[PDB]
Amino acid sequence: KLEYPHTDVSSSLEARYFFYLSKINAIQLDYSTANEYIIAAIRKAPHNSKSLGFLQQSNKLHCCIQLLMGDIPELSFFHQSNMQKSLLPYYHLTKAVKLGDLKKFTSTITKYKQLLLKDDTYQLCVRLRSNVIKTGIRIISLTYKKISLRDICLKLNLDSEQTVEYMVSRAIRDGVIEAKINHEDGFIETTELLNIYDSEDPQQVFDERIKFANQLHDEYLVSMRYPEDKKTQQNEK
């Protein structure tokens, strides 16, 4: 409908709004934008101990969003948080996904099924079952550039050579693993090598940064003269 006001509101209000958008966007499988709102939700929000629910639940949700991407939240995020007691489930999941073990991921969720259900992060975890496999073959892509089908199956305990090809195809459709299969020739060959200052893509990266800097250059200007007006208009000693 799109009429939400920023005109005469508080920052807490902005923090509230952003948290709701993140949930909707994350499950509609648009994690990029859900992540970008949840970071902002935390920033816009005040940081105090009367703000502890908000801080705790927005830090929990953010990390679930990174695993959905395929990223790993920082280990250091969890240990140096003074809310480390309740981020005990999440330290575990971030580890299970990293190590790629299927067995560890199932076992962890079975314990903290209830814990996750409270904070509405259980819904995210069903899909993190898919995400185990993806991380595990992201490791495989970075270690090995040419790796026979059998070798992948032995490491990761996958049933058939045909099966693991289907799984890699899905991933390279979305362009994460960026590999290309050779079925006939019986290997998978990593196709990522970057070297992109030779392409025109850095012009597009530079468009955003100048655009970003521009945004502040307008914002200061409009706000700054605004309080000054009243003070001259009003009596002074």
């Binding site: 940064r209 200007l221 706000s223 700054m224």
Partner: protein, 304 residues
């Protein structure tokens, strides 16, 4: 004798004088103002320092009839050596804008006061050109190619306005306009860059038209023009060579440095914001104080 006229520097004294002189004879309707130009000559750089009118008539019935007073040229020489001996006759301005063949014959006359070939300085006084307010040509005599005879002809030799230093002072005084082209700030050069594209494009359009008229309407092939055009096709940038690719890398190199600068300013601009809000903070307190302070003032009047 020398064929040295490769650069022609013009003092702005010459262009405004030619503007006046046309109007002090009142020539019009392809009648011309023919006067002398003085300066230094017999040299690689010609500096056109001064200009004067002469008595002159121009007949429209036959272009081989005009008047000129010879005795005037001899008497003006005596006088100008006394003011300045660095001034000598170097040739003649002609109002133009149309160059004619009879002007070669006027040229011959002026070749009897100066050792060098005379400079014929076309100064458009009608102000139809938005550029070229000076075009310079010098008569030289050469065997022309393609079975052609020896022709006496006026070849273009580079000219630019550069101003003397003594002239400069007045140029500064009379220019009090903002100057649309002056090479200023970001603004001034974005206006220029557009102006520059339409400049070139029109210049390019004359070449197209010319070429068509050679084989349509049978203009005389002038092989000098055509030679220059061979090199136009030979200095064309060709894509897909490692040179063009390095240029696209260099556009990112340059924009890279522009990005770091843009961030650095964002901190200055935010610095200014911070510093105002501190002032406003204080001002809230000062205005609050007035309200308390009144009570203190009111009480005194009652007492005393």
């Amino acid at each position: 004798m020398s064929l040295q006229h490769e650069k022609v520097t013009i003092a702005p004294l010459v262009l405004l004088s030619a503007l006046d002189h046309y109007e002090r004879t009142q020539t019009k309707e392809n009648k011309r103002c023919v006067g002398v130009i003085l300066g230094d000559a017999n040299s690689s750089t010609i500096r056109v320092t001064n200009s004067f009118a002469l008595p002159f008539e121009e007949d429209e019935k036959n272009s081989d009839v005009w008047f000129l007073d010879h005795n005037y040229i001899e008497n003006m020489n005596e006088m100008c050596k006394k003011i300045n001996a660095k001034e000598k006759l170097i040739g003649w301005y002609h109002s133009g804008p149309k160059l004619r063949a009879s002007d070669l014959k006027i040229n011959e006359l002026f070749k009897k006061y100066t050792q060098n070939n005379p400079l014929l300085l076309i100064v458009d006084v009608k102000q139809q050109g938005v550029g070229l307010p000076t075009d310079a040509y010098v008569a030289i005599e050469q065997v022309k190619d393609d079975g052609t005879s020896t022709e006496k002809t006026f070849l273009h030799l580079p000219c630019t306005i550069e101003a003397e230093e003594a002239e400069e002072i007045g140029v500064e005084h009379l220019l009090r306009d903002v100057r649309d082209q002056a090479a200023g700030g970001l603004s001034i050069r974005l206006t220029n860059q557009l102006k520059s594209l339409k400049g070139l494009q029109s210049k390019l359009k004359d070449v197209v038209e010319y070429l068509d008229k050679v084989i349509n309407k049978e203009l005389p092939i002038n092989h000098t023009i055509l030679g220059k055009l061979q090199d136009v096709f030979n200095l064309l940038p060709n894509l897909g060579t490692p040179d063009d690719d390095e240029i696209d890398v260099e556009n990112h190199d340059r924009i890279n440095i522009s990005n770091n600068l843009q961030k650095a300013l964002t901190v200055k601009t935010n610095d200014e914001l911070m510093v105002i809000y501190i002032s406003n903070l204080v001002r809230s307190i000062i205005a609050f104080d007035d309200l308390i302070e009144n009570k203190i003032q009111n009480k005194k009047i009652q007492e005393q």
